[PDB]
Ligand binder design. Structure first.
Ligand SMILES: C[S@@H](CCCN)C[C@H]1O[C@@H](n2cnc3c(N)ncnc32)[C@H](O)[C@@H]1O
Ligand SMILES: C[S@@H](CCCN)C[C@H]1O[C@@H](n2cnc3c(N)ncnc32)[C@H](O)[C@@H]1O
Ligand SMILES: C[C@H]1CC[C@H](N)CC1
Ligand SMILES: C[C@H]1CC[C@H](N)CC1
Lengths: 294, 294
């Protein structure tokens, strides 16, 4: 479990045994906050003003968000799931304490309410202080923001409660561990309504392709009718990309083409990454990973 | 600018003023070569065998190739350009002294001859010694390999010589400098046959978007009828991606949909990244960059 010692000689170095032998490094202008939380080690620094990255957040030594590229993952998770759903009115976010996916969910006019549950209340608090453009969602009249374990939350929730569940979690080492398990997905399937859509933080085709194969297999077997992995460019996640498994409870749904294209909604031109062309492209995978989606 | 000092404390750190404030880092197991060439600083190392990267080559401190992900860029440049041409028989490769694009170009049955011209004979020599799976192509009877400057080579070539020109260069700092220039593209246009295609090493949408905008405009200005940027995933290039400008001399050519799909050719199944679905997907650009193609 990495902590403060990743910042050394003016650089943050993302050394981790979850990706042995490589580390993304960012020069540190100023550390804004660095402390153990009740659950994780949280570090926030201002990176070199000569580069574009701005403020950076890491949890247990893993880069979470930067000012410069945070729009990609937030938009892809928010809009790829909601544009796959016929009328998403009630949405649950597990994790996502920075507010980024919530910001994108609330651009949707169909959404009446979004619950957000993150185990670590300090992520919400520091995101409010140091990433106001990411966390201003947390104060929305349509949001509830709860501190708690996501596994316990879904287990306490009634059948058929949500239209969309978005699992925006840290990596499997640390308190997100069980959120990558089959028993959790089974409960996710149960709290979804019949036309339910679920997407997650689905890890890397370069480093975690075997995990991605495992998850897509067991999520289909637990009872989701379809699962398709969407690939996105994020320079500051390990190896420059991350994906999301986009899962439909209802059979005969094609999540790879937008059901409700964002281009018909008034906020499409505000987005910096996602549009319907990017939605469709994100499901095309390099030949070596294409078996995930075939 | 950078040399041997990029290896320190068991690690290679890709620090460079072309991407200020950031660096990919790789643990070094054994240094295999590290010395100035006639033109540039060449570093070759075996990376951590606990990680997946294998052998790594850097020029002037910029990572050029690793065993693990070299297939992406070489497949994309070789096949996106050739599959856009009705019958590519003569091909020129500028740069490319590692052999990788050449390996891909020679899979095509239509190719009768390929000239490859790279300024650095030592790159070719070290590629044969440390990267035999990349450099096997250099001895092919269908290739003529030259050590020389690409600028002078194209200036000395007759009009209408080549079906395809591929410009596989290092970054603009160092001997590739003028290969990013409008004078060079004028000559490239002149040496293409009337249905000629050109593609290049087109840099990063995250770090070099203004350069990509300028190049795209001047290449159209010099008389290419169209220019489209294809985006690809390469973990070990800065920000984890790179692109290629795919340029048609003839009007009426849509390079973004394959003219000669690879799936109809006998080697398609041998590829590890590229296929027609990936080709089409490569031209969908995040909103913030999409003005390049639209
Ligand atoms: C910051 S968010 C990812 C950054 C891009 N939005 C990842 C969050 O997952 C939370 N997380 C990790 N484990 C859990 C559990 N078990 N429950 C809820 N939230 C969790 C963790 O506190 C981070 O804030
Ligand atoms: C290694 S190759 C890129 C690695 C992915 N194939 C880049 C080559 O560009 C050559 N290069 C740089 N400048 C020139 C000029 N001016 N002419 C030809 N080749 C050049 C340089 O020697 C590298 O071998
Ligand atoms: C959102 C989550 C942050 C941690 C990364 N390693 C993977 C993606
Ligand atoms: C091929 C070329 C090598 C150096 C990188 N910065 C860009 C891509």
């Amino acid at each position: 479990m990495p902590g403060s010692e990743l910042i050394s000689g003016g650089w943050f170095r993302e050394e981790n045994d979850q990706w042995p032998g490589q580390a993304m490094s960012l020069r540190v202008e100023k550390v804004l906050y660095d402390a153990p939380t009740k659950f994780q080690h949280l570090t926030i620094f201002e990176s070199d003003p000569k580069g574009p990255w701005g403020t950076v957040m890491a949890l247990d030594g893993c880069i979470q968000v930067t000012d410069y590229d945070e729009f990609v993952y937030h938009e892809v998770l928010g809009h790829t799931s909601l544009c796959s759903h016929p009328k998403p009115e009630r949405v649950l976010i597990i994790g996502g304490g920075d507010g980024g996916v919530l910001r994108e969910v609330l651009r949707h006019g169909t959404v009446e309410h979004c619950d957000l549950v993150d185990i670590d209340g300090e992520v919400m608090e520091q995101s409010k202080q140091h990433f106001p453009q990411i966390s201003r969602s947390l104060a929305d009249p349509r949001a509830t923001v709860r501190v708690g374990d996501g596994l316990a939350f879904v287990r306490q929730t009634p059948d058929n409660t949500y239209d969309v569940v978005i699992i925006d979690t840290t990596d499997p080492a640390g308190p997100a561990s069980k959120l990558f398990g089959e028993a959790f997905y089974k409960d996710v399937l149960r709290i979804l309504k019949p036309d339910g859509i679920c997407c997650n933080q689905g890890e890397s085709i370069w480093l975690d392709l075997e995990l991605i194969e495992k998850m897509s297999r067991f999520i289909r077997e637990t009872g989701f009718a379809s699962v398709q992995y969407a690939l996105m460019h994020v320079p500051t996640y390990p190896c420059g990309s991350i994906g999301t498994l986009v899962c439909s409870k209802k059979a005969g749904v094609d999540v790879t083409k937008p059901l409700r294209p964002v281009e018909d909604m008034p906020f499409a031109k505000d987005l910096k990454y996602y549009d319907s062309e990017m939605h469709k492209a994100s499901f095309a995978l390099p030949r070596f990973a294409r078996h995930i989606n075939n």
